[PDB]
């Protein structure tokens, strides 16, 4: 029929290791590679153009070499991961990432305010990621090119662009891919009936607590039901970590300058709302995507507070 015409392109799963391919310009990328993406755009149903020659396309890990490369870079073997990452990237590459008070933020789009406050929070706590994909993308994000980092957060969290997201859950996912091995927490629970029992927590469980926003109150003791039915007290015995994260269902809470690192504010309900970020510097700054305001005091519906730590031992 038609004289065969070809171009050379490269396929990849990590945008570093390239794989030479010769493609037939009369067949779609999908017929030759399976699902195929060009900087996030789905080109599966597109036939090669001359302008494509020499360009790099993402594909799914469909042979053993690509499977190993994908696991080594992303630390996942979820079959749909790369598709979800590319689908997110096609949107996040169009977002804007302004510098707000020296931090990379995200201009509002696509219901992304939970991602903005997560990204702002990471830049204020000591954290190293384990997957090279997150290491590389986070470095770019700090420099101001955060599109790949934001698309990876979405893919790791199984959230699509626009989907309702929770900051505490997002942070927990990101912490699972970070090196928290040297973090340790010891708690004690005291019941006037049953007595007392210590517990040691490690890793992500050592830096996250759900039930109170106040780190000081956590050191003093919080009231929880004992398994016997009577009210008991749980308090922090020992902490070794560079930060802690305290979370609670949103409630009116007063943030005092100098007593915390940063916080997440949620205005809304369980199906509808909006996040803002508060950071304690020379004064209290409220970052709302690209928007910035200041105040000497702050009271709002807070749901997460971050604090600095290094080593703490109770006197109780
Ligand atoms: C001897 C004894 C046995 C059971 C309990 N009850 C308990 C222990 C722990 C570790 N966490 C708890 N959360 N709710 C209750 N908890 C206590 C305080 C002492
Ligand atoms: Zn008890």
Residue numbers in the entry: -1 to 314
Q: Mind quoting what the paper says about this structure?
A:
The X-ray structures confirmed our NMR studies, showing class A fragments bound at the S4 subsite adjacent to the BL2 loop region, while class B compounds bound at a previously undocumented binding site in the finger region. Class B fragments were found to occupy a pocket near the zinc binding site in the PLPro finger region. The triazolopyrimidine ring of fragment 11 is placed in a pocket containing V187, Q195, T197, T225, and K232 with a hydrogen bond to a water molecule bridging K232, while its phenyl group is extended into the hydrophobic pocket formed by V188, G193, and C192 next to the zinc site. Interestingly, the chemical structures of the class A fragments (e.g., 6 and 7) and class B fragment (e.g., 11) are similar in their primary structures, yet they bind to distinct sites on the protein based on the different NMR shift patterns and the cocrystal structures. Despite their structural similarity, the methyl group at N-1 is the key to the binding preference of the compounds. This nitrogen is observed to create a hydrogen bond to a water molecule, which links to K232 in the finger region. Although there are well-defined binding pockets and clear avenues for elaboration in both classes of fragment hits, the increased flexibility of the finger region and variability in binding pose make the elaboration of class B fragments a more challenging prospect. Additionally, the distance of the zinc fingers from the active site of PLPro and the lack of conformational change associated with fragment binding raise concerns as to whether class B compounds can modulate the activity of the protein. However, no inhibition was observed for any of the class B fragments, despite many having a higher Kd than their active class A counterparts, suggesting that ligand binding at the zinc finger region of the protein is not capable of modulating PLpro catalytic activity.
